[PDB]
Each structure stands twice: as C-alpha cells, then as structure tokens.
Design a protein around this ligand. Structure first.
Ligand SMILES: *[C@](O)(C(=O)NC)[C@@H](C[C@@H]1CCNC1=O)NC(=O)[C@H](CC1CC1)n1cccc(NC(=O)C(C)C)c1=O
Ligand SMILES: *[C@](O)(C(=O)NC)[C@@H](C[C@@H]1CCNC1=O)NC(=O)[C@H](CC1CC1)n1cccc(NC(=O)C(C)C)c1=O
Lengths: 305, 305
C-alpha cells in the first residue's frame, strides 16, 4: 500500500537517446533502428526562431551538417527528411538496443512518463499528463528539447511526445513522434497562450478510488448525484464534462471498492463546494487529476514490464 | 523551467534486479558482480514471521534451496551468508551489467529514487526521502520486497535502501545494503509504531528557493527572523530544528536568488502561522519537504548521469 506519482522505468528509452548538433544548436534525438528523430528547430539560429521558413532553412542543409553522437560513437547520416515538425535522419547503423515500440498520439487526459535529457544524456524521469489545453506541466531547461514521453505495455514502448517549447506560464508544448503538435501551437518564437486549463474529472475520480483503497475515506459522503446534475457543478469549477464512457472506464474501480461511480461523484461535488477545509487526501492538499484509471489499477495491482 | 518530483533514470539498476525464491516465498534481489543481495525474510513462512529465529531458520537451508532467476537465466548459488537483515548469495556468474556502485547509509532528510519490482521485474520508479522517523512514504504491494533505493553520481550508483516492511500507517521500513534497518524497526510481524513524523525544514526552504526561481514568489515577505526565534516557531509546528550546517547548505541557493536564508525563514514562519490561505506554490497546496538543496540544484541546472 501507499500511493505515489511514479513513472515507468527508463532503461529501455535511455538506450534510444542521442545528441544531435546542427549549426551551433545541439539538442536530443531518438534513435530507433536506422533513424534518428528530433525537433526540426535544430537547424535554426536564435534569430531564425522569430519566424523561420523551415523548408528554405533546410535546403541549405545536407547530411554532413547533422552531427549525431551516441555517447562517443558518431553515426553517419546517409539521408534526412522533415516530417511535420520533426526531422528524421537516416543513419548507417541501426540501434542495437531498439526495443519494441510504436508511435501513439494520446488523448487529452492521458498520462505518460518523460525522460528528460540534456546532450543525449538522460538527467531524470517523471510522469505527466496531456492537459486538456494540450500543454504539460513539465520540468524542461534549455537543452531539454527532443526528450520524449512514453508508455510501456510490458515490452512495447509507446512514444506519445517529443518536447519542443516552453510557454510564458512555465509549461511546455510538443509533438507526437509523427511531429504534429498537440494543441494549436507552432514551433516559432511568437506570442502563444495556453488557453483555459481544466481539470481531468475522470482522473480525479480514480485518485479518489485509490484513496479509498488506501484507507483515506473521510471524504466519502452519504449523498449520491446524477450525471447531468454533477456536470453542472463541474463546468462551474472548470472540470472536464464526464461521459458515460468515463463511467464505463471507472467500472472495475467502482466494483472493487463497492462505491458506485455517481456516489463518488457525489463525494467529489461536496469537496468542490466545501473545499478540503485543511485535511489531506493521499497527502495532497488539493485534488490530483494526473492519474488515469489505468495508472491506479497498475499501482494497486503491481503490474510489471 | 517548471518543477516536478523526478527520479534518476532506472536503466542502470534494472539490469541488477533478479527474482529470488526460497520455500514458497519469492521476492526481489539485487545482483552485483557474483553476489545477489536480498531480505533474509525470504526463508520465512507466514507463520515464521510472527517470531523467527533467523540463525536457526537458516541452518536448515542450503545453497540449492535458493532459486535465483534472471529473467530466464538461472544462476547457481555456490555460497550464502546472512549480513544483519540481508542475505548475500555467492553465485557462479558475475553480473555483466554491474555498474559502478557503492553502499551508502543516508541521513534522515536525504532523498533517493526507488525502483519498485515484482518478481525481479521493475514495475516503476519514484523518488522519496528518509523521513525523520526513519520511514518512507512509498508505494509497495506484496512481492515488492528487496526492491531498492538509489542515487546516481554521473556514473556511480549509490545504494541506500532495500525494502522489507509495511507499517500500520501505510508506510514502509527497510535496510541499507549492509542490512541494518533505518530507525528502530525489526524484521518480524510484531506491533511497531512509526514515531512522530516531523517536517524536513531545510528541504522545505530549498523548495521555496525553487519556487522563487520559477516565479512563484508571492509568499516572499518583508520580515526577516533569527535562527533561535524561527526554531521556536518550528518546534511548535513539528519542524526539524535548523542548524548552521543547514544554512551553509542553502548558501548557493541563497546567493543565486538574492534572498538571504533568514529572510526565507521569515517567509516560511508566516506561512506556518497563516497557512496557505487557499493559494498554491509550485502547484502544491501544502509545503513539500521531500526535495534536498541538491535535488533543486540538479533540476534548476539540468545535470545528467
Ligand atoms: C529547446 O529549444 C531546447 O532545449 N533546445 C536546445 C527548448 C528549451 C526551452 C528552454 C526552457 N525549457 C524549454 O523547453 N525550447 C525552446 O527553446 C523553443 C524552441 C522552439 C522552436 C520554438 N523556444 C524558442 C524560442 C522561444 C520559445 N518560446 C516562446 O516564444 C514563448 C514566449 C511562447 C520557445 O519555446
Ligand atoms: C515483503 O515481505 C514482500 O513483498 N514479500 C514478497 C513486503 C510486502 C508488504 C506488503 C505490502 N507492502 C509491503 O511492503 N513486506 C512484508 O510482507 C513484511 C515482511 C517483513 C519480515 C517482516 N511483513 C510481514 C509481516 C508483517 C508485516 N508488518 C507488520 O506486522 C506491521 C503490522 C508492523 C510486514 O511488514
């Protein structure tokens, strides 16, 4: 028992991280088979940033401009290509440690582990979620770019994110591994606002089930509610509307704990209307919406990879 | 920018994790060179737990009783030995992936990453701290035992913890890698209380510096205080007394942020006396004492391993 924020192990992704230099700018890249992926903004200077034409900035580059270092091993680029906002670099050697893997585009609310890298070298690891505004509350210094977000399904590593930008708010935007941005963001140094950051209601609810399971259950309440009724109170506290599909998802928790979904929605509502009044749940003095149903399952079942 | 709880990468420790069966009971062990370390309570049955004599439970064991599985590779035990509350198993093969490593015994307040394992297989990773009561707020299901806590110093992996027990509170106790328990705990199923869990003041202060650095600075206060004065207010809020050595440690933060230690101690005091009154710091609605000065440095500097 006990409950914490925890990431999948990094191990598998560590051996896919490489350093990529072009011009001066060096950042991180990801090496799978005979391809190294990275943010295309590696070809830009601090000036190009303000309004780059990537197509045209790229014509003036050739394979040999792109230095790719695997610790000390220098890989030869024998081809290159821009896919959306990523660059794909054909290289001579295939990665001996390439795991099973896939490129996924997660839905908002979905969580993933992030291995933060500086200069191809991984500095640390943490879990975060694709916030409803399509940002993420990460920790990314300069040099962090091209670091990635991933899930693991026993063997298979799912790549959901590649890091590109920081926003005025101290939050981050980035791409799937096909290089399309989550949200409306562009890889340019222009003014860009997040949008309204809402709470992932379904994830909050699971966090409650996890609480129950761990014998933090004081916030349980005799009241029940209806779906429509509860959403009225959600919308007003800026909570993502809750669908039938969200309830479905919370079924196995619901079953296990003996607490009906809507009774848990009742208990939540009263916490919105009445705050936490000082107390803590699982040590957190606020509500935590960066845990999927699945995350909770995993951690209250002890799954491995 | 941004700030999160993040662990070192696991990678290096993953390749040292193995499964150890004796009797029925299987748990995790750690394989360095030609030795596999694990909690000695692997030789016990659910009954032995209530009051085992380990010496005598052990005489009736021999090398072949101890099954050690590295994925599928079965290692041959050619020797065994009890060190305090751990068992050391001489085996035929040395671990090809053994990194540089050391056995450390951390001080209370010190943090470390934990890679939680079930059946030699690592399920996930999180950071936690040796609480002043010598417990840790972990997430450990049955089968988690022998999972370990570690730091990394570029190359060198420092082993600070091996997991053994859960306590009535949903908290955990365990050993250094020489097998001595942190705190007064014993590997037996008897009644054991944590003791008073105090807050790691010095770590809180660094978390504030990290806040400042990230432009959460509302809690900054014109007042200053004295060391003796502030401790009076600490003791009463159950905060670890603050030494000169703690101030020393907070120097480089102090310098960088331009905020004197005692001015930060002033700002803290008022947060004790006045609560957070609703607001959040770095998204946390309480004070976070599971970040070392060093942790903060690392994350606001981008160090790698
Ligand atoms: C990345 O470029 C990197 O690590 N390069 C070596 C990364 C670094 C950021 C600094 C702090 N945390 C980070 O994520 N991001 C940027 O530098 C990006 C590059 C992308 C192509 C734009 N970057 C550059 C310039 C300006 C911005 N941001 C803004 O203009 C905001 C005001 C919206 C930016 O994100
Ligand atoms: C560990 O034994 C394991 O994983 N074995 C396969 C581990 C499992 C715990 C269950 C939930 N989280 C855990 O950490 N710990 C125990 O089972 C320990 C073993 C040590 C030798 C005692 N254990 C066994 C029996 C009873 C207790 N605890 C208590 O009696 C408390 C009431 C103090 C215990 O920790």
């Amino acid at each position: 028992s006990g409950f914490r924020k925890m990431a999948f192990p990094s191990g598998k992704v560590e051996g896919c991280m490489v350093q990529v230099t072009c011009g001066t700018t060096t950042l991180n890249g990801l090496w799978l088979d005979d391809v190294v992926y990275c943010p295309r903004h590696v070809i830009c200077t601090s000036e190009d940033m303000l309004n780059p034409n990537y197509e045209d900035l790229l014509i003036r580059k050739s394979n040999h401009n792109f230095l790719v270092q695997a610790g000390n091993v220098q890989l030869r680029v024998i081809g290159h290509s821009m896919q959306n906002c990523v660059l794909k670099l054909k290289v001579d050697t295939a990665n001996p440690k390439t795991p099973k893997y896939k490129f996924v585009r997660i839905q908002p609310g979905q969580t993933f582990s992030v291995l933060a890298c500086y200069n191809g070298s991984p500095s640390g690891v943490y879990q975060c979620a694709m916030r409803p505004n399509f940002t993420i509350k990460g920790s990314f210094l300069n040099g962090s770019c091209g670091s990635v977000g991933f899930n693991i399904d026993y063997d298979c590593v799912s790549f959901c994110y590649m890091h590109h930008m920081e926003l005025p708010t101290g939050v981050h935007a980035g791409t799937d591994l096909e290089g399309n941005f989550y949200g409306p963001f562009v890889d340019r140094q222009t003014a860009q606002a997040a949008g309204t950051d809402t709470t992932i209601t379904v994830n909050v609810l699971a966090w409650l089930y996890a609480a129950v399971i761990n014998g933090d259950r004081w916030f349980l309440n005799r009241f029940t509610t209806t779906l429509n009724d509860f959403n009225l109170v959600a919308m007003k506290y800026n909570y993502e509307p809750l669908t039938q599909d969200h309830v479905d998802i919370l079924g196995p928790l619901s079953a296990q704990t003996g607490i009906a979904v809507l009774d848990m929605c009742a208990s939540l509502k009263e916490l919105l209307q009445n705050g936490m009044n000082g107390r803590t749940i699982l040590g957190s003095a606020l509500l935590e919406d960066e845990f999927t149903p699945f995350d909770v399952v995993r951690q209250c079942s002890g799954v491995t990879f």
